[PDB]
Design an enzyme around this catalytic site. Structure first.
Site, PDB file in Angstrom:
ATOM      1  N   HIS A  52       0.680   9.806  -3.785  1.00  0.00           N
ATOM      2  CA  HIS A  52       0.921  10.304  -5.147  1.00  0.00           C
ATOM      3  C   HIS A  52       2.327  10.813  -5.462  1.00  0.00           C
ATOM      4  O   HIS A  52       2.576  11.291  -6.575  1.00  0.00           O
ATOM      5  CB  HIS A  52      -0.079  11.414  -5.462  1.00  0.00           C
ATOM      6  CG  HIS A  52      -1.506  10.979  -5.349  1.00  0.00           C
ATOM      7  ND1 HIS A  52      -2.082  10.096  -6.236  1.00  0.00           N
ATOM      8  CD2 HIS A  52      -2.483  11.325  -4.473  1.00  0.00           C
ATOM      9  CE1 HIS A  52      -3.349   9.906  -5.909  1.00  0.00           C
ATOM     10  NE2 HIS A  52      -3.615  10.639  -4.841  1.00  0.00           N
ATOM     11  N   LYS A  56      -6.869  -0.163  -3.464  1.00  0.00           N
ATOM     12  CA  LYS A  56      -7.288   1.067  -4.126  1.00  0.00           C
ATOM     13  C   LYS A  56      -7.373   0.782  -5.632  1.00  0.00           C
ATOM     14  O   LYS A  56      -6.467   0.147  -6.198  1.00  0.00           O
ATOM     15  CB  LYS A  56      -6.312   2.210  -3.829  1.00  0.00           C
ATOM     16  CG  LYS A  56      -6.723   3.550  -4.444  1.00  0.00           C
ATOM     17  CD  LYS A  56      -5.967   4.711  -3.799  1.00  0.00           C
ATOM     18  CE  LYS A  56      -6.423   6.055  -4.381  1.00  0.00           C
ATOM     19  NZ  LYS A  56      -5.608   7.204  -3.870  1.00  0.00           N
ATOM     20  N   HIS A 103      -5.236  16.758  -3.093  1.00  0.00           N
ATOM     21  CA  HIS A 103      -5.802  15.639  -3.842  1.00  0.00           C
ATOM     22  C   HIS A 103      -5.267  15.581  -5.253  1.00  0.00           C
ATOM     23  O   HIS A 103      -4.895  16.599  -5.823  1.00  0.00           O
ATOM     24  CB  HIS A 103      -7.336  15.704  -3.907  1.00  0.00           C
ATOM     25  CG  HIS A 103      -7.986  15.695  -2.563  1.00  0.00           C
ATOM     26  ND1 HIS A 103      -8.440  16.844  -1.951  1.00  0.00           N
ATOM     27  CD2 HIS A 103      -8.229  14.680  -1.698  1.00  0.00           C
ATOM     28  CE1 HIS A 103      -8.958  16.533  -0.775  1.00  0.00           C
ATOM     29  NE2 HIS A 103      -8.839  15.230  -0.595  1.00  0.00           N
TER      30      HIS A 103
END
Ligand code: ZN
Ligand code: ZN
Lengths: 121, 120
Positions: B12, B39, B112
């Site tokens: 990310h 993904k 996350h």
């Protein structure tokens, strides 16, 4: 393509990894970036990526005044202001944390100057 | 230990994007090894590690029970899989945005990214 002014801008105005952002941060950073002989009176560090700051010269900035650019979004910054009048080191600083628009000068797509006099909304 | 935080950056974090189109997503997904299997949805944040981590601290607010929302917008690029096959090569649509992001933190570190979050 000479990187001199761009790197100078980074030395004086860029810190992607600040710690504290209080007077101690300002006092150590102004020393580490060699802005203390003489004591630089006002100096702001930008806390963001080189890419995002550079983008002010392109997509992410607007013309401001005759030759400057203003960012289209706010940036995390810490302004170090010299206190105590005397221009000789050691240099004491107050530190002002802010999240605000920044005005810079760009040359050939790179940041080369930070407008310390700009007052952001 | 750093495992989940680094994993968060691998998937990310990109301080130096170019293009931010389908080609960006396809190269980045492959580079970050998010392609075996492909993904489905993945967002890259274009800001400093420090500013993203700050969402766990002063530049964030609590969101849900276990998450954090940033107090400011971030430059992001969301890569959404297309073409229907979970095998490489993995194809992507790219969506550039400047938006609030929601993450999970553990002990001050981002671990996350909430892909389901819809920003105003
Ligand atoms: Zn960084
Ligand atoms: Zn798919």
């Amino acid at each position: 393509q000479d990187n001199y002014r761009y790197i100078k801008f980074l030395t004086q105005h860029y810190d992607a990894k600040p710690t504290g952002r209080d007077y101690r941060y300002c006092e150590s950073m102004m020393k580490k970036r060699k802005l203390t002989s003489p004591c630089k009176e006002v100096n702001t560090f930008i806390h963001d990526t080189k890419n995002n700051i550079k983008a002010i010269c392109g997509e992410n900035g607007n013309p401001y005044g005759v030759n400057f650019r203003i960012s289209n979004s706010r940036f995390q910054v810490t302004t170090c202001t010299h206190k105590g009048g005397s221009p000789r080191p050691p240099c004491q600083y107050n530190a002002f944390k802010d999240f605000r628009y920044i005005v810079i000068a760009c040359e050939d797509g790179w940041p080369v100057h930070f407008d310390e006099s700009f007052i952001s909304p």
